[PDB]
Amino acid sequence: VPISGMRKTIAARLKESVTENPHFFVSTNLSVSKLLKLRQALNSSADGRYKLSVNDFLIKAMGIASKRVPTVNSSWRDGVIRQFETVDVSVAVATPNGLITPIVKGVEGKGLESISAAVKELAKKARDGKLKPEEYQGGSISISNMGMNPAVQSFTAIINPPQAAILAVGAPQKVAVPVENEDGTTGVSWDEQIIVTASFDHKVVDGAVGAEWIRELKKVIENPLELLL
Amino acid sequence: VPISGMRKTIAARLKESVTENPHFFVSTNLSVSKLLKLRQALNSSADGRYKLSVNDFLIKAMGIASKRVPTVNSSWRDGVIRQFETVDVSVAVATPNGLITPIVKGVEGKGLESISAAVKELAKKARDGKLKPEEYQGGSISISNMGMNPAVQSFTAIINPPQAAILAVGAPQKVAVPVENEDGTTGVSWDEQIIVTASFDHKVVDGAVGAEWIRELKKVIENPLELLL
Amino acid sequence: VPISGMRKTIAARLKESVTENPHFFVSTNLSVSKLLKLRQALNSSADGRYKLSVNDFLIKAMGIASKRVPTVNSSWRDGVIRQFETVDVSVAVATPNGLITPIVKGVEGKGLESISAAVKELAKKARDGKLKPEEYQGGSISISNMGMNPAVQSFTAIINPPQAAILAVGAPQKVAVPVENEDGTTGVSWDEQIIVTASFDHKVVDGAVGAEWIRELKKVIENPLELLL
Amino acid sequence: VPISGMRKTIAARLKESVTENPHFFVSTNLSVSKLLKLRQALNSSADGRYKLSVNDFLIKAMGIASKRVPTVNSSWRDGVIRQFETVDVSVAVATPNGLITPIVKGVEGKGLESISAAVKELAKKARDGKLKPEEYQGGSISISNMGMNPAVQSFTAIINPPQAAILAVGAPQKVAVPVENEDGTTGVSWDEQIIVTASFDHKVVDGAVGAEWIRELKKVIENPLELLL
Structure with a gap:
């Protein structure tokens, strides 16, 4: 089968x-x-006005972490480092034509409902093939999701240039975790865990910086009430 | 005692x-x-990096309500209604010199920590007398707080022009509230209530619109988790 | 946005x-x-021939109070007080176009069923925009209702001229009330209360007169059987 | 922001x-x-003369494994494989300036106390910026540590040339492990696990050889008493 020609550009990239x-x-x-x-509680306290997912929380936390550690939200240019201030998030969508990366703008201080609406709109527009180049050309940071497929415990991806991280x-899984009952003996509690994998470019970011970013992300997720901050 | 002259301007206003x-x-x-x-929980889950109050939550909720009902965030001009998109919040501070109204900019989508930091800075700068005119000339909506004084149950204020609402x-108080125990009998529960008073200008806003705004405020407060939205 | 022009007249008024x-x-x-x-009992003892609300009882009680104290049912004219004998009641309706005040005529001695029918007809005719000027130009006393919105505890309004009171x-609310059981000990009973706010013009009416009017209203309500009288 | 120029060399490397x-x-x-x-036992049976950590034990185990399998302790040169005899260990240190790799010489048969002392000296000297080129230019094998950050379950690194492995x-974590009680039933015990990631060069080393190296390391650690051997 000859090549479609479109795949050539993605291969070169x-x-x-x-x-x-x-x-x-x-x-x-x-x-x-x-x-x-x-x-669950936010979906219940509603009148069909919205519907949330895990990816939106993840995107908000990404924005918060990028704001707390701005070195990640960067790029590599001609003898110069371009550092942004806002967070432009590239979300991946798997169409029958292949892969595409629409963008969400100004995530930090935007609202989960607006985020979900924009994501749904861009996803359906991508399934229909109705996008502009500006909508998927740019972005400082990216993300890919596979939570619907429960078999994938973890996976890596590739940095869509000229960005620095992805x-x-x-998927979620069941894991054993210790717990202290009211007495001195320990016990078994079943917590729902997710594995997260971050690929970084080493020219800009170092291991300590990546670790700090991941620590802030973990903290924000484990204490969801800090999303307000 | 002759008049300071500064009070003349405020009287005329x-x-x-x-x-x-x-x-x-x-x-x-x-x-x-x-x-x-x-x-209390957000204060406990901190390293002295920040400290929160009630006014900040109130300001965030004001921004949310203003965005859900933009007619409030309005004004009255020469034969034209000027409607904003962002929410500029005028916070009152009681100096020994009198009253002053610094401004917070872009509340919606800003974060409670940044809000508290800006409010503390502006309050101390007002106590010192180190402000610019632009920092307290403008704003679409205003607020006054008296929570430190436990005697005041309710009170009215006056609309700082050219705005439309304030x-x-x-203060907080203890009130009796019914509660249903596990059995069919009702019981007495002590809830911490606050009275809130909103003054509106009638040229722009109507009773139904003000009631809708207040309903949204009450909803967001009573369900604090919707502050994320 | 330029002004519709209709709001200009209401602003001037x-x-x-x-x-x-x-x-x-x-x-x-x-x-x-x-x-x-x-x-509830009057609604149950019916064949769908009618359906009642709280506003109708309130209007009947307003008529009774106005007749017991005719000084309220008054006005202010050119060097003369115009005093009526009947009670013409201006009921507010909130259309998407704004606010409007249809009138009910000869309330005292009319009947709750006729009152409800006339109010429903006038409300639907106002939603359709099919009124005559005489039907909303006049009236000695006025009223505004917000019972559908459970958030509003109390609110003020403005006196539609040339009337003297409004x-x-x-909304209704749950309040704690003492009650004496069969024994000498007191107990807690949950009563359904409403807050009512009456605005008066001070040229015609005095505080004592307004208080007397409100006392009669409270009496007739708390003893609903006196609606016959 | 222009590039410092020092990062250019590291990026090229x-x-x-x-x-x-x-x-x-x-x-x-x-x-x-x-x-x-x-x-803990060695720290308690001491008079402040020394203080130990996990990195030192790991370094000793690395030396023992390299001596039992010398093919890893190798390199790639111009048409020739250079094989050493001793073990020169490059330890990473994260300064605000970036990353640096001081060296420990003659690890095998040196002593944990001497190891810890030399590592503390080199780490403080790197934080001060007082090193010679020979002290961080050379080395047969390397290591990077992130144990202080409890969020990092695992990570990869990049092989500092001309070496062959890293x-x-x-961080340590709590994991469920089976255990046989005195009776026939199994039980739950909480063992402290660490994940270890080794990156190899495929020109020199094969999967079997790397697996053998890892097996020897795991064996030496799980039986610490063989450190004497």
């Missing part, structure tokens, strides 16, 4: 990415038992 | 306000038993 | 009202636990 | 590493419940 930017990966485990309760969220 | 703009008031009762728990927050 | 007529307010609390039972009915 | 040497990763899990007891030690 990914090749440029891996040959220009070295990659190193970080892998962590989050606890989402409180996040799911929050999502995220990946596996 | 308030006279213009009351003679140009008719005033009608709306008085409601909120429930903050969950809000105070939330504030808020007032009394 | 309200400005004339507040600048010509000083306003003072009287705020009381009623008890409707018997009224609601009466309404009413306002908040 | 890492680009050379990834483009010249392929990378494959091995990931295992260790058990340190005995190691921590040993560390290690990475995640």
Whole structure:
């Protein structure tokens, strides 16, 4: 079967990415038992005006972490580092034509409902093929999601240039965790864990910086009430 | 004692306000038993990096209500209604010199920590007398607080022109509330209530619109989790 | 947005009202636990021929109070007080176009069923925009209702000229009330209260007169059987 | 912001590493419940003359493994494989200036106290910026540590050339492990695990050889008493 020609450009782009930017990966485990309760309660306290998902919370937390550690929200240019202030998030969508990366603008201080609405709109517009180039050309940081497929515990991705970092969220799973009962003996509690994998470019970011970013993300997720901050 | 002259300007301003703009008031009762728990928990889960109050939550809720009902965030000009998009909040501070109204900019989508920091800075700068005119000339909506004084149950205020509405927050109090125990009998529960008084200008806003705004405020407060939205 | 022009007339009218007529307010609390039972029983003892609300009982009580104290049912004219004998009641309706005040004629000695029918007809005709000027130009006394909105405890309004008084009915609420059981000990009973706010013009009416009017209203309500009288 | 120029050299070096040497990763899990007891005992049986950590034990185990499997302690040169005899260990230190790799010489048969002392000296000298080039130019094998940050379950690194391998030690975590009580039933016991990630160069080393190295490391750690051997 001859090649469609469109795949050629994506191949060249990914090749440029891996040959220009070295990659190193970080892998962590989050606890989402409180996040799911929050999502359930917010979905219940509504009149069909909205519907939330885990990706929106993740995007808000990404914005917060990028604001607390601005070195990640950066790029690599001609003998100069371009540092932004706002957070432009590239979300991946898997169409029958392949992959596409619409963008959400000004995430920090935008609202989860607006985020969900924009995401649904862009996703349906991508399934219909009704986008503009500006909507998916740009972005400082990216993300890919596979939570619908429960088998994927973890996976890596590739940095869509000229960005510096990219995220990946596996599926949820059941894990054993200790717990102290009211007495001195320990016990077994079943918490819902997710694996998260972050790929960074090493020219801009270092291991300590990536670790700090991941720590802030984990903290924000594990204490969802800090999303207000 | 002759007059300082500064009071002359404020007298003329308030006279213009009351003679140009008719005033009608709306008085409601909120429930903050969950809000105070939330504030206590966020304060405990910190390293002295921040410290929260009730006024900040109130300001965020004001922004949310103003965005859900933009007719309030309005004004009256020469044969034209000027409608904003963002929410500029005028907070009152009581100096020994008198009263002053610094402004917070872009409340909606800003964050409670940043709000508290800006409010503390502006309050100390007002106590010192180190402000610019632009920092207290403008704003679409205003507020006055008297929560430190436990005697005041409710009170009205006056609309700082050219705005259209202003808020007032009394002190907290203990009130009796019914509650259904596990059995069919009712019981007595002690809830922490606050009275809130909103003054509106009648040229722009109507009773139904003000009531809708207050309903949204009460909803967001009584369900603090919707502050994320 | 330029102004519709219709709002100009209402603004001028309200400005004339507040600048010509000083306003003072009287705020009381009623008890409707018997009224609601009466309404429920009259609704049950019917064949769908009619359907009652709270506003109709309130209007009948307004007529009774006005007849017991005719000084309220008055006005202010060119060097003369015009005093009526019948009670013409101006009921507010909130259309998407704004606010409107249809009139009911000869309330005292008319009947609740006829009152409800006329109010429904006038409300639907106002929603359709099919009224005559005479039907909303006149009236000795006025009223505004917000009972559908449970958030509003109390609120004020403005005197539609050339009248002298206007009413306002908040929402119902649950309040603690003492009660003496069969033994000597007191107990807690939950009564359904409403707050009522009456604005008066001070040229015609005095505080004592307004208080007398409110006392008669409270009496007739708390003893609904006196509606016959 | 322009680039400092120092980052250019590191970026070029890492680009050379990834483009010249392929990378494959091995990931295992260790058990340190005995190691921590040993560390605690040696720390308590002391007079402040020394203080130990996990990194030193890991370095000793690395040396032992390299001596049992010398093929890892190698490099790639001009048409020739250079094989050492001793073990020169490059330890990473994260300064505000960036990253640096001081060296420990002659690890095998040196002593944990001497190791800890030298590492503390070099770390403080790197924080001060008082090093010689020979002290961080050379080395056969490397290591990076992130144990202070409890969020990092695992991570990869990049091979500092001209070396052939590099290690990475995640944080400790609590994991469920079966255990046989005195009776026939199994039970739950909580063991402290660490994840370890090793990146190798495929030109020199094969998967079997790397697996053998990792097996020897795991064995030496899980039986700390063989450190004497």
